[PDB]
Design an enzyme around this catalytic site. Structure first.
Site, short mmCIF file in Angstrom:
data_model
loop_
_atom_site.label_atom_id
_atom_site.label_comp_id
_atom_site.label_asym_id
_atom_site.label_seq_id
_atom_site.Cartn_x
_atom_site.Cartn_y
_atom_site.Cartn_z
N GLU A 46 13.32 30.69 37.97
CA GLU A 46 14.56 31.22 37.57
C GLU A 46 14.77 32.67 38.00
O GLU A 46 13.71 33.46 38.23
CB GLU A 46 14.79 31.23 36.26
N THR A 104 6.71 27.88 19.69
CA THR A 104 8.24 27.76 20.12
C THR A 104 8.61 26.37 20.66
O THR A 104 9.67 25.74 20.20
CB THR A 104 8.57 29.12 21.05
N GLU A 142 -19.10 42.37 37.42
CA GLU A 142 -20.18 42.04 36.40
C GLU A 142 -19.53 41.43 35.13
O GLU A 142 -20.35 41.17 34.30
CB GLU A 142 -20.87 43.42 36.26
N1 LIG Z 1 3.78 38.24 24.22
C1 LIG Z 1 4.79 37.86 24.85
N2 LIG Z 1 5.00 36.37 25.26
C2 LIG Z 1 5.83 36.02 25.77
C3 LIG Z 1 7.00 36.92 26.26
N3 LIG Z 1 7.92 36.28 26.99
C4 LIG Z 1 7.66 35.12 26.87
N4 LIG Z 1 6.45 34.84 26.05
C5 LIG Z 1 6.09 33.71 25.78
O1 LIG Z 1 6.23 32.51 26.76
C6 LIG Z 1 6.44 31.44 26.18
C7 LIG Z 1 7.43 30.59 27.06
O2 LIG Z 1 6.52 30.23 28.30
P1 LIG Z 1 7.26 30.64 30.01
O3 LIG Z 1 6.46 29.99 31.07
O4 LIG Z 1 6.80 32.05 30.03
O5 LIG Z 1 8.80 30.44 29.81
P2 LIG Z 1 9.30 30.45 31.59
O6 LIG Z 1 8.83 31.58 32.08
O7 LIG Z 1 11.01 30.32 31.28
O8 LIG Z 1 9.17 29.02 32.06
P3 LIG Z 1 9.70 27.80 31.82
O9 LIG Z 1 10.24 27.72 30.33
O10 LIG Z 1 8.94 26.56 32.10
O11 LIG Z 1 10.90 27.87 32.67
C8 LIG Z 1 6.97 31.64 25.03
O12 LIG Z 1 6.66 30.55 23.86
C9 LIG Z 1 6.40 33.01 24.53
O13 LIG Z 1 5.33 32.72 23.57
C10 LIG Z 1 6.67 38.11 26.25
O14 LIG Z 1 7.31 39.07 26.69
N5 LIG Z 1 5.69 38.94 25.48
MG LIG Z 2 10.56 29.63 33.16
#
Ligand SMILES: Nc1nc2c(ncn2[C@@H]2O[C@H](COP(=O)(O)OP(=O)(O)OP(=O)(O)O)[C@@H](O)[C@H]2O)c(=O)[nH]1
Ligand SMILES: [Mg+2]
Ligand SMILES: Nc1nc2c(ncn2[C@@H]2O[C@H](COP(=O)(O)OP(=O)(O)O)[C@@H](O)[C@H]2O)c(=O)[nH]1
EC number: 3.6.5.-
Lengths: 20, 426, 153, 428
Positions: D62, D170, D245
């Site tokens: 995206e 989530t 290491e």
């Molecule tokens: N700690 C932290 N976790 C994040 C953050 N942004 C997203 N996440 C985690 O990422 C999860 C979602 O997975 P992602 O693969 O990043 O979502 P995406 O990049 O849109 O990938 P798709 O949903 O498959 O399109 C959420 O449940 C969050 O827990 C962030 O800024 N900090």
């Molecule tokens: Mg995504």
């Protein structure tokens, strides 16, 4: 009604001063 | 990059679509003239999802309008916000359906689908790549139901790998509006269960109650109910237009919510809903929204969630808020109400957060659920259909166009199978 | 006489609203610049911007944002003129006010710094070659106004 | 002489990388516009004269978050074509991220990685940021890791995965996605560090007394941890450890390579003044159950290998005294076949604090990485959830229609059972 909306990204990563 | 094309059919569909376009144009700061009058550069960064550029700074909505009579078309053209629609996108017949499913689906649909399909294909090919389709119609109508079903079948035949979202109204439980409501409702449901991907169900009694009690408006006009439906639509689709902390588009919601191919009927909600007067005595925070969404009186479908068990719940938040509060609220509501959720599926809640609240508010949320309470609606519809079909009432109006008893029997069997499925997955 | 503060506040509010649409402003500038050719010389005067306005550029929003920018310039000129009406350091600061808001004045090399990060949102080529000065004009004038008021009071 | 390449995949990876890169710029004094008014060659390149460009790649299907980064302040820093986007996202679909959408962009990503590696001469390894529960962060990450292992192999690979929390979760297909990506990457990864969101929320609340934390704060903490990890390469100290290491000291068995990270001390300005932060005190605080960043209770397991990375004004004699006291402590128990389980590294660069943040400035800091057997309970819960959903065959038609067969689900289940058995056998 005025629009005073801005994303959280721009209001957090402001240009910080460079340290010495 | 992600283009959405909107299709309308019938009186209810046309009016709701006009209200929806009004709301959307208000969100992006586009005046009824057709020129951009916004205030921030975030509003026109993703104006391609719903609008097309033309000549010097003029944006025209990408919509197609379908009907059999020129009445409501003339009414919407002469009304407000009617000078932005493309004059070539008004397609209309001359006869009319007259609350007959057969006439809409077999007689005049044949001569209307060629033109409407040509227009839709031109709009689709105008862009680079599509994202999906939308449709607003009525299950119990005569022209809306048949025309929308025929269009859905044609598009699914031609474009087989795009999402299809339908926002259709359903017959009221207390007092009906048409005598032949169950026949059209049954046939429309039988087609929709197989030719779509996710359907949002909306009633009228719920809207009447909401507008009567929450906003204490003694004159509930269709403008207000259409505004509520448009607000729900915008809340559903807002994530594809503005940046947020945790994005979630339409396909993500579809993947996360529907577990089985035939269990794809949703019922929406909205929050907050407060009166003009009592707004001063309320604190607008995340806990209030979490308390408000999970209630029977705040939902737009006339059903009681206490009578069934939830499968999947998706909530989309708008505005500036903390993720920790949302997570704690969702965990608390899932843990203290374990009796209202199915056990073989864990984590029944999906959360998305945006960063642009609706105009006139500070923070708002949209509730979309997939429960087992739709079995009550389908059971009532099937019972009414059996009661009327036992005496073959009003049936000579259908056989005179090309119908047969086999179609009625098959539709009733499909309803019985679907309601048995919902009952046995409990 | 402690009465132009309201005008200053209105001017800075409108400047903030324009700074939100800075990106559209740059796009309009680039489109009109392509339409009027003369692409080897960067922007150097406000009168050039007004001429680019008068030349057919259309697109509605382009004219809107350019008109807003020229309105800010006119109000800044009015304030430079009126601060002397309301009455050495103040003298040459007001002289700088007048000479910078004057239409016929080179502004290609003008730049801004911390806390103003207007130049950080530009691409490298445009920042160092084309639009370094135009976006860096108003904040300098506002800083001069605030400094002059600080000396006066 | 030594260089490291960072790859950020998915929304979480992109945002964490943004936070860590702004922290890097602040530490090294490079202005956000790329102009610096001699040890930054590890992470920053040189472009002709006066301009420095980072060595990183941002990938996301995206275009929203990448477009926001391009529009944001740090646009005069990243190379214009070092940021890669697409048209449609995976949308919580491992099959979509692994078979259909990623195969027209892996080629471009690999080309950019090869072009970056051409510039370097002393490349050390890759750092990959992703999330288990995300469709793209699972499928595309697995595809990229397998392609990198095919192409290079010899160089080490490290990951920073966001482990899904047992309760606060989530999405709904997170167990499916995590099981599939674990089964795919078990044979290709080298050492995958683990963090969680609920644990960081608890730490933030309890310590900094912040009522409304946010992803920005969480990413700042993660960036602090990553900077503490990479400080040994970035600067020079009395005893520095490289990226080669780490795996040798932390991975005793071919498939037991799932450590977890810990940071201490984390406090606010109010408690900064009324506190004497000593080496022994911070070392003791780093071992308490309510300070690690993975939601599990350490008394259900036994430690195997621990890596200590002291940072700042540090004295070896009191470091050794603290280690000896921790070893003498009876509550903490170790495994029988590991007589020695401590690796100590010291750096002379005190931690750097971002102005306007929630972290007070200090003089010493401890970053701890632990390999323990307590992850068996988490894996048990996760595969129990997988079995519960898969009994009824729910959500399977999406994966089936995208080009997957139930044999993959069965094989992943068997592999996870084998891994749990291996942990159970090794624990005794
Ligand atoms: N700690 C932290 N976790 C994040 C953050 N942004 C997203 N996440 C985690 O990422 C999860 C979602 O997975 P992602 O693969 O990043 O979502 P995406 O990049 O849109 O990938 P798709 O949903 O498959 O399109 C959420 O449940 C969050 O827990 C962030 O800024 N900090
Ligand atoms: Mg995504
Ligand atoms: N909410 C809402 N419902 C409407 C509106 N107009 C019509 N309806 C519903 O549509 C139903 C009538 O179907 P109709 O559209 O007239 O049938 P058709 O003309 O053959 O498509 C009634 O039950 C109404 O409740 C409207 O403006 N708002």
């Amino acid at each position: 009604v005025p629009l005073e909306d801005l994303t959280n990204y721009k209001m957090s990563y402001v240009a910080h001063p460079l340290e010495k | 990059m992600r283009e959405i094309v909107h299709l309308q059919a019938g009186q209810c569909g046309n009016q709701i679509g006009a209200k929806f376009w009004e709301v959307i144009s208000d969100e992006h700061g586009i005046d009824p003239t057709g020129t951009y009058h916004g205030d921030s550069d975030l509003q026109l960064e993703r104006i391609n999802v719903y609008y097309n550029e033309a000549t010097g700074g003029k944006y025209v909505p990408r919509a197609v309008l379908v009907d059999l009579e020129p009445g409501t078309m003339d009414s919407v053209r002469s009304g407000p916000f009617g000078q932005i629609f493309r004059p070539d996108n008004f397609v209309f017949g001359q006869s009319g359906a007259g609350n007959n499913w057969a006439k809409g689906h077999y007689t005049e649909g044949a001569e209307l689908v060629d033109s409407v399909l040509d227009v839709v294909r031109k709009e689709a090919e105008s862009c680079d790549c599509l994202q999906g389709f939308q449709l607003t119609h009525s299950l119990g109508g005569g022209t809306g139901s048949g025309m929308g079903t025929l269009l859905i079948s044609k598009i699914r035949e031609e474009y087989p790998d795009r999402i299809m979202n339908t926002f259709s109204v359903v017959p009221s439980p207390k007092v009906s509006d048409t005598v032949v409501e169950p026949y059209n409702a049954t046939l429309s449901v039988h087609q929709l269960v197989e030719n779509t991907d996710e359907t949002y169900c909306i009633d009228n009694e719920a809207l009447y109650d909401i507008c009567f009690r929450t906003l204490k408006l003694t004159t509930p006009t269709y403008g207000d109910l259409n505004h509520l439906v448009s607000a729900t639509m915008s809340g559903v689709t807002t994530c594809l237009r503005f940046p947020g902390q945790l994005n979630a588009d339409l396909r993500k919601l579809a993947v996360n919510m529907v577990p089985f191919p035939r269990l794809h009927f949703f019922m929406p909600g909205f929050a907050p809903l407060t009166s003009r007067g009592s707004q001063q005595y309320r604190a607008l925070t995340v806990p209030e929204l979490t308390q408000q969404m999970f209630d029977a009186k705040n939902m737009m479908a006339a059903c009681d969630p206490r009578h069934g068990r939830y499968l999947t719940v998706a909530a989309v938040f708008r505005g500036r808020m903390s993720m920790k509060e949302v997570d704690e609220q969702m965990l608390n509501v899932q843990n203290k109400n374990s009796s209202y959720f199915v056990e073989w599926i864990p984590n029944n809640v999906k959360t998305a957060v945006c960063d642009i609240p609706p105009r006139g508010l500070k923070m708002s949320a949209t509730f979309i659920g997939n429960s087992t309470a739709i079995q009550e609606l389908f059971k009532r519809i099937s019972e009414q259909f059996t009661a009327m079909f036992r005496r073959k009432a009003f049936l000579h109006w259908y056989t005179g166009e090309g119908m047969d008893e086999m179609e009625f029997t098959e539709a009733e069997s499909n309803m019985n199978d679907l309601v048995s499925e919902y009952q046995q997955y409990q | 006489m402690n009465e132009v503060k309201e005008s200053l506040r209105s001017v800075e509010q409108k400047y903030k609203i324009f700074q939100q649409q800075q990106f559209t402003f740059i796009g309009a500038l680039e489109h009109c610049r392509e339409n009027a050719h003369d692409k080897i010389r960067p922007i150097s005067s406000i009168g050039q911007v007004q001429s680019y306005m008068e030349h057919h550029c259309s697109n509605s929003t382009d004219r809107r944002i350019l008109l807003m920018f020229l309105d800010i310039c006119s109000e800044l000129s009015k304030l430079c003129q009126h601060f002397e009406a309301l009455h050495p350091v103040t003298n040459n600061l007001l002289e700088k006010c007048k000479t910078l808001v004057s239409q016929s004045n080179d502004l290609s090399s003008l730049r801004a710094k911390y806390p103003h990060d207007v130049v950080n949102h530009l691409s490298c080529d445009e920042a160092r070659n084309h639009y370094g000065g135009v976006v860096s004009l108003i904040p300098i004038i506002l800083d001069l106004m605030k400094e002059w008021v600080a000396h006066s009071e | 002489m030594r260089e490291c390449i960072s790859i950020h995949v998915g929304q979480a990876g992109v945002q964490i990388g943004n936070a860590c890169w702004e922290l890097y710029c602040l530490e090294h004094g490079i202005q956000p516009d790329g102009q610096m008014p001699d040890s930054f060659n590890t992470f920053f390149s040189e472009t002709g004269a006066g301009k420095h460009v980072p060595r990183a790649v941002f990938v996301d299907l995206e275009p929203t978050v990448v477009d926001e980064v391009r529009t944001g302040t740090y646009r005069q820093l990243f190379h214009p074509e070092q940021l890669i986007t697409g048209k449609e996202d995976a949308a919580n679909n491992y099959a979509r991220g692994h078979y259909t959408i990623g195969k027209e962009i892996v080629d471009l990503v690999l080309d950019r990685i090869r072009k970056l590696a051409d510039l370097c001469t002393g490349l050390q390894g890759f750092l990959i940021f992703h999330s288990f529960g995300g469709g793209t962060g699972s499928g595309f990450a697995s595809l990229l890791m397998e392609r990198l292992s095919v192409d290079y192999g010899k160089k080490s690979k490290l990951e920073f995965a966001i482990y899904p929390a047992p309760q606060v979760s989530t999405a709904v297909v997170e167990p499916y996605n995590s099981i599939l990506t674990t089964h795919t990457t078990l044979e290709h990864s080298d050492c995958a560090f683990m963090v969680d969101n609920e644990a960081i929320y608890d730490i933030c609340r309890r310590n900094l007394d912040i009522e409304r934390p946010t992803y920005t704060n969480l990413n700042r903490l993660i960036g602090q941890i990553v900077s503490s990890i990479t400080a040994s390469l970035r600067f020079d100290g009395a005893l520095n450890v490289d990226l080669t290491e780490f795996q040798t000291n932390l991975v005793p068995y071919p498939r037991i390579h799932f450590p977890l990270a810990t940071y201490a001390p984390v406090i606010s300005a109010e408690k900064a003044y009324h506190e004497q932060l000593s080496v022994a005190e911070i070392t003791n605080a780093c071992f308490e159950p309510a300070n690690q960043m993975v939601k599990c209770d350490p008394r259900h397991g036994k430690y195997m290998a621990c890596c200590m990375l002291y940072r700042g004004d540090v004295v070896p004699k009191d470091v050794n005294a603290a280690i000896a006291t921790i070893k003498t402590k009876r509550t903490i128990q170790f495994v029988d076949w590991c007589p020695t389980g401590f690796k100590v590294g010291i750096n002379y660069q005190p931690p750097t604090v971002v102005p306007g943040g929630d972290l007070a400035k200090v003089q010493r800091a401890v970053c701890m990485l632990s390999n323990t057997t307590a992850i068996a309970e988490a894996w048990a819960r996760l595969d129990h959830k997988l079995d519960l959903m898969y009994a009824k065959r729910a959500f399977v038609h999406w994966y089936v229609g995208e080009g997957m067969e139930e044999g993959e689900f069965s094989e992943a289940r068997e592999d996870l059972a084998a891994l749990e058995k291996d942990y159970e056998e090794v624990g005794v």
